[PDB]
């Protein structure tokens, strides 16, 4: 049915730092998109096909904190700007899109869903341009097709004068490629 989303915050500044250092995270996990932080930065990771993915330019080679200490990346592809860990216990994965639709829907770190028109393999245009401050920290989040299946991961925003009209994304296909 219709895409709708909500956000919940599970950790504050201080538990985040401590957890970053111990690499030990005991909180229960839910949902399909995880809000993630480093020391300097916060963004999104999306679970597709049992793996939790996000952008290399944010995570780098870093481990992810888990109930069992740090967990090493399963996939690392610098050219694709794509990184992946095994999906946390309790997360739920998105299904890759197979309908080839050109009407995409980007899920934001604030849990808004904004319409995007597909204009290429890896680029889409916003139907309503937005201030860049808005999309900040949404990198790593999903572009969905009308059925709610994953088409791609938000990679970068094309901004002019602080206003975004287009986004570049990593297509689901490149995920599957990276998996091989």
């Amino acid at each position: 049915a219709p895409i709708t989303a909500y956000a919940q915050q599970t950790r504050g500044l201080l538990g985040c730092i401590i957890t970053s250092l111990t690499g030990r995270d005991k909180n229960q996990v839910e949902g399909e998109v995880q809000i993630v932080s480093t020391a300097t930065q916060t963004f999104l990771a999306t679970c597709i096909n049992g793996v939790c993915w996000t952008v290399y330019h944010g995570a780098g080679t870093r481990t992810i904190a888990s109930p069992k200490g740090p967990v090493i990346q399963m996939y690392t592809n610098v050219d694709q700007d794509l990184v992946g860990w095994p999906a946390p216990q309790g997360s739920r994965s998105l299904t890759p899109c197979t309908c080839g639709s050109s009407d995409l829907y980007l899920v934001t770190r604030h849990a808004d869903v904004i319409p995007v028109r597909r204009r290429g393999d890896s680029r889409g245009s916003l139907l309503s341009p937005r201030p860049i401050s808005y999309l900040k920290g949404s990198s790593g989040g999903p572009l969905l097709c009308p059925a709610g299946h994953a088409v791609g991961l938000f990679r970068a925003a094309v901004c002019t004068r602080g206003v975004t009209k287009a986004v570049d994304f990593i297509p689901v296909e490149n995920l599957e490629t990276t998996m091989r």
Partner: peptide, 21 residues
């Protein structure tokens, strides 16, 4: 270098609900 940390989540799979009292 520190581990990436889950600080929050977005849930896509919830559907319309009457808010409980």
């Amino acid at each position: 270098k520190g581990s990436v940390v889950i600080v929050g989540r977005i849930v896509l799979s919830g559907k319309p609900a009457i808010i409980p009292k």
